[PDB]
Design a protein around this ligand. Sequence first.
Ligand SMILES: *Nc1ccc2c(C)cc(=O)oc2c1
Ligand SMILES: [K+]
Ligand SMILES: [K+]
Ligand SMILES: [Mg+2]
Ligand SMILES: [Zn+2]
Lengths: 4, 364
Amino acid sequence: RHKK
Amino acid sequence: LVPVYIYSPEYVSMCDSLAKIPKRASMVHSLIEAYALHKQMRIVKPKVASMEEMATFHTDAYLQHLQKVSQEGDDDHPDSIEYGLGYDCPATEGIFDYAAAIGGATITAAQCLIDGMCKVAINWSGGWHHAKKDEASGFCYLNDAVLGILRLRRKFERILYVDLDLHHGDGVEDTFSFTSKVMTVSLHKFSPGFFPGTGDVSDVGLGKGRYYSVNVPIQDGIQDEKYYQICESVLKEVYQAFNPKAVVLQLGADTIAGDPMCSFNMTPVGIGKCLKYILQWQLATLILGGGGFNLANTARCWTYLTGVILGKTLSSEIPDHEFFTAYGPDYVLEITPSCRPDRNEPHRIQQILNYIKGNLKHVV
Ligand SMILES: *Nc1ccc2c(C)cc(=O)oc2c1
Ligand SMILES: [K+]
Ligand SMILES: [K+]
Ligand SMILES: [Mg+2]
Ligand SMILES: [Zn+2]
C-alpha cells in the first residue's frame, strides 16, 4: 500500500 | 447528436463535500455554465445507485461497512484499515451517500448511451478508478467506472476503457484483468514510490484477458506533443486490434501543469487532441473526470474539453462568475506549461511503444  | 450532461444542484452539492477536492464540482459546473455550454447539451439528473446496483461490483461486506461508518463518521473502526479507509479515504459522515450518488450518476450516463439518447454522456464528477470490490483506495470509495462498464456491457460486446489520469487505473484494470471483452488502456506516471505503484508495460492482464490490458509508464515532465504522439500511436493500434463497440474515457486532470502533484506538464489542448482522436471513432462514449488538485485548472481543463465535445471554440477570457477570483493572475482559459525538464527519453518511449505493439499482435 502506497499513499496517494 | 446532442451530448448528455449529468447534473443536478443536489448532485454537485454532494460531490463538493469530498474533502480531497472540496468545491471542485461547483467550480467545474460554474465555469461550464459561465461559457453557456450547458445550453448545448441534454441535462440529465443522476439517479442514486441502489444497494443492488452498487453490489454488482462491490461486496456486501464492504458496502455494509461503508454504510456503517457513514452513520456517525466513525474513523476509528477496527475493520476500516482492512477496507482501505484511512488517510487517503477517511470514513467521513455521509460518505456512503456520496459514493451512492457518484455510482448512480455514472450508471445513469451509461444508461443514456444504451438507450441511444446520445453518443456522448458526460459525468465530470466521476472516474474514481482506484476502488476495488472490497477496498477503498486513492480517494475512491466506490468504482463508478467499473459500474458504468458493467452497465454498458448489457448492450456493447467489447468495451474499451481509456484512462488518461496521472495515476494508474489499477481498480478498473484489475477488475477486468481476466476478460477479453473489456480492454483497458492506461497512460500514467510510473516511478518507485509513486501511487499506486502498479502498471508497468509488462502488465498485460491474465488468463483469457492476457494482452487485453495495456499500460504506458511515463516519467515526470511530459508535454502535449510527446504525450499525443504516444497516445495516438497506442490508440491507433488498439482500435485496429480490438474493434471496440463503446468507449469509457477517464480524463483526470492531475496531469495538467499547475497541479500540486507537479508530475506531468500537460495542457488541456494536448488532452483535447487525444479526446478528439477517440471522438472521431463515432462510438458510444462515456466521459468521466478523476483526479485534479488545482481546482481552477481542473475546471479550465474540463470546460475546454466540453467545448471540444461540442465542437466549439471558447473565448480565452474567463467570464465573470461565482469563482472568477480563483482564476488569477491571468484570468484566461489556456494553461501555460511549467519550465521544468521532460524526463522521458526518446529511446525508452520507443521501447515501450514497440513492446505494446508486439502485445497487440496477439489481440485478434
Ligand atoms: N495521497 C495524498 C497526497 C497528498 C495529500 C495531501 C497534501 C493532503 C491530504 O489530505 O491527502 C493527501 C493524500
Ligand atoms: K491513467
Ligand atoms: K481486460
Ligand atoms: Mg538516461
Ligand atoms: Zn489521479
